Scaffold this active site. Structure first.
Site, PDB file in Angstrom:
ATOM      1  N   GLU A  13      12.868  26.909  94.776  1.00  0.00           N
ATOM      2  CA  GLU A  13      11.467  26.782  93.918  1.00  0.00           C
ATOM      3  C   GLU A  13      10.377  25.884  94.988  1.00  0.00           C
ATOM      4  OE1 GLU A  13      13.229  24.495  90.524  1.00  0.00           O
ATOM      5  OE2 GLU A  13      13.587  26.380  89.514  1.00  0.00           O
TER       6      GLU A  13
HETATM    7  C1  LIG Z   1      18.451  25.378  92.524  1.00  0.00           C
HETATM    8  C2  LIG Z   1      17.964  24.988  91.095  1.00  0.00           C
HETATM    9  O1  LIG Z   1      18.885  24.919  90.073  1.00  0.00           O
HETATM   10  N1  LIG Z   1      16.772  24.419  91.037  1.00  0.00           N
HETATM   11  C3  LIG Z   1      16.264  23.810  89.855  1.00  0.00           C
HETATM   12  C4  LIG Z   1      16.582  22.405  89.466  1.00  0.00           C
HETATM   13  O2  LIG Z   1      16.350  21.602  90.254  1.00  0.00           O
HETATM   14  C5  LIG Z   1      16.858  21.851  87.830  1.00  0.00           C
HETATM   15  O3  LIG Z   1      15.665  21.923  87.572  1.00  0.00           O
HETATM   16  C6  LIG Z   1      17.803  23.334  87.243  1.00  0.00           C
HETATM   17  C7  LIG Z   1      17.833  22.929  85.714  1.00  0.00           C
HETATM   18  O4  LIG Z   1      18.837  23.994  85.418  1.00  0.00           O
HETATM   19  O5  LIG Z   1      17.306  24.743  87.434  1.00  0.00           O
HETATM   20  C8  LIG Z   1      16.310  24.783  88.688  1.00  0.00           C
HETATM   21  O6  LIG Z   1      15.022  24.742  87.921  1.00  0.00           O
END
Ligand SMILES: CC(=O)N[C@@H]1[C@@H](O)[C@@H](O)[C@@H](CO)O[C@H]1O
Length: 506
Positions: free
Chosen positions: A326
């Site tokens: 992200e």
């Molecule tokens: C690699 C990854 O999962 N990145 C983000 C993590 O920081 C968290 O926000 C998560 C929640 O499920 O999902 C994603 O938005």
């Protein structure tokens, strides 16, 4: 032939001479006639191929004795000898079946003796997790249980994992959890043969690891979390203590410092990390994607190097996780450049790099780099596959922070709902084709989890499903079977003090 899928159990969740409850399911398990009885006079005998190996097995034996003594109220001690006495548990690596690999073992219980035969100490440790599951429910209690005969059926088990990497990630950046809380989760996971623990030590809302050359990462960047609680951090000594605790369980700790995105806590600590030279305000919301290190400023790479240098000094894993997810405030060209530069820094400090997709696409990645494939789309890891990179899969089914159901009181839902059934009914080969799949990692993100009870509720029983996906061969996996086994296992979850969710699908 007629087939069907599972619905919810009528009238609610079932989780609301002898019966072992082995989870993950082992390669083979047969029972014969008779039983072994564990009595107050039992000793654990250990024997390796040389004195150094015997000494390592001795430590494993003592860990096993500690667990047995807590529930039986006995004082089982450990003996370095290959002449076990009737009523003994015997742990040995002499004559291990090499086909079972580093983590495999045979576990044969007769009337007179329990014998665990492995290739390596690591395998004796995994086998010991099965041994605990052959004893009656009650054995996993942390206080003495009376009125239960401590019996094990005459039985024969052989076992080995399908995948080498079977991991759990805990997000300690979104909400902080104490060294005790983290140790407890490591300990619980180890009992289900989880062998890797990935710590997400920094994100937008907090920075959780002491970096001596940049003290304000803690003085400023550790002082909050999601929702504006006080936050917290680990000193380097506390991080070493966690690593050592995991090591006693043959669990590798892979620390993550996420970059170039998910970096607001660093940006809030040091103004010089920002284009305008001013510290960002700390963030206590749950937004993602907005933060970025300066990809073209040398200060950025000095910062990364200092962090990597200190972390590498205290983290014996050959891997460091540099995140890479992200980075929506970083251009493709700058991301490619940034990730290649930080991989070169890590490699110079003797560490191989793990990164979330799309980090494998960096032209600075090497075949020693590892991709953590969370997106699990048709095109994800095209780069990794071309480069010969190992792949750890974390699909929706391993996103254990997802709500079990629409009405779950905690959790997210951006990957849909993940109940115990969904957490079970998949295979790593579903996620990516044509790859070297290193294994699976269950990710527990903590946007909505504040207490230990919240962690317990989301990880159990979901993690049990994921743990079987990593360990048990696909041909031997079957939801109807696992479901019934999970019901049988429920009292053991109770006994361990785990505040699990009583899933209505079980
Ligand atoms: C690699 C990854 O999962 N990145 C983000 C993590 O920081 C968290 O926000 C998560 C929640 O499920 O999902 C994603 O938005």
């Amino acid at each position: 032939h007629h087939h069907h899928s599972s619905g919810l159990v009528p009238r609610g969740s079932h989780m609301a001479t002898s019966q072992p409850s082995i989870l993950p399911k082992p390669v083979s398990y047969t029972v014969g006639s008779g039983q072994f009885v564990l009595t107050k006079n039992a000793s654990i005998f250990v024997a390796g191929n040389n004195v150094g190996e015997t000494d390592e097995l001795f430590n494993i034996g003592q860990a096993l004795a500690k667990k047995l003594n807590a529930s039986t109220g006995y004082t089982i001690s450990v003996v370095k000898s290959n002449q076990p006495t009737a009523g003994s548990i015997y742990l040995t690596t002499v004559g291990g079946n090499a086909a079972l690999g580093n983590e495999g073992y045979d576990l044969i219980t007769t009337s007179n003796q329990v014998t665990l035969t492995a290739n390596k100490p690591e395998g004796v440790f995994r086998g010991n997790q099965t041994l605990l599951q052959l004893l009656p429910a009650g054995i996993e209690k942390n206080t003495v249980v009376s009125g239960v005969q401590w019996v094990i059926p005459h039985s024969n088990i052989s076992d080995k994992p399908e995948y080498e990497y079977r991991g759990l990630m805990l997000d300690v950046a979104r909400h902080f959890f104490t060294v005790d809380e983290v140790k407890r989760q490591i300990d619980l996971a180890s009992q289900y043969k989880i062998n890797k623990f990935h710590m997400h030590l920094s994100d937008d809302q907090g920075w959780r690891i002491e970096i001596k050359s940049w003290p304000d990462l803690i003085e400023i960047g550790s002082k909050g979390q999601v929702g504006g609680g006080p936050g917290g951090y680990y000193t380097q000594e506390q991080f070493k203590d966690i690593v050592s605790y995991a090591a006693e369980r043959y669990i590798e700790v892979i620390p993550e410092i996420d970059m170039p995105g998910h970096t607001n806590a660093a940006l809030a600590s040091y103004g010089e990390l920002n284009p305008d030279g001013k510290r960002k305000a700390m963030r206590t919301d749950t937004a993602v994607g907005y933060s970025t290190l300066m990809p073209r400023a040398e200060i950025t790479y000095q910062f990364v190097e200092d962090v990597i240098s200190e972390l590498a000094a205290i983290s014996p894993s050959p891997y460091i996780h540099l995140g890479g997810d992200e980075s929506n405030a970083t251009s493709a060209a700058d991301y490619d450049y940034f990730f290649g530069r930080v991989t070169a820094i890590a490699n110079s400090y003797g560490k191989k790099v793990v990164g979330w997709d799309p980090s494998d696409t960096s032209s600075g990645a090497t075949s020693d780099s590892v991709l953590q494939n969370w997106t699990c789309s048709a095109s994800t890891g095209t780069a990794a596959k071309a480069k010969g990179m190992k792949v750890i899969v974390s699909p929706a089914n391993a996103y254990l922070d997802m709500k079990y159901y629409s009405d779950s009181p905690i959790g997210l839902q951006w990957r849909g709902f993940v109940n115990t059934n969904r957490a079970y009914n998949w295979d790593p080969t579903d996620c990516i084709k044509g790859a070297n799949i290193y294994g699976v990692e269950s990710t527990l993100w903590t946007e909505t989890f504040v207490t230990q009870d919240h962690l317990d509720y989301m990880l159990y029983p979901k993690l049990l499903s994921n743990a079987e996906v990593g360990w048990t061969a696909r041909g031997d996996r079957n939801w109807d079977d696992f479901k019934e086994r999970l019901i049988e296992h429920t009292p053991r979850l109770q006994n361990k003090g785990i505040k699990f969710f009583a899933d209505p699908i079980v």
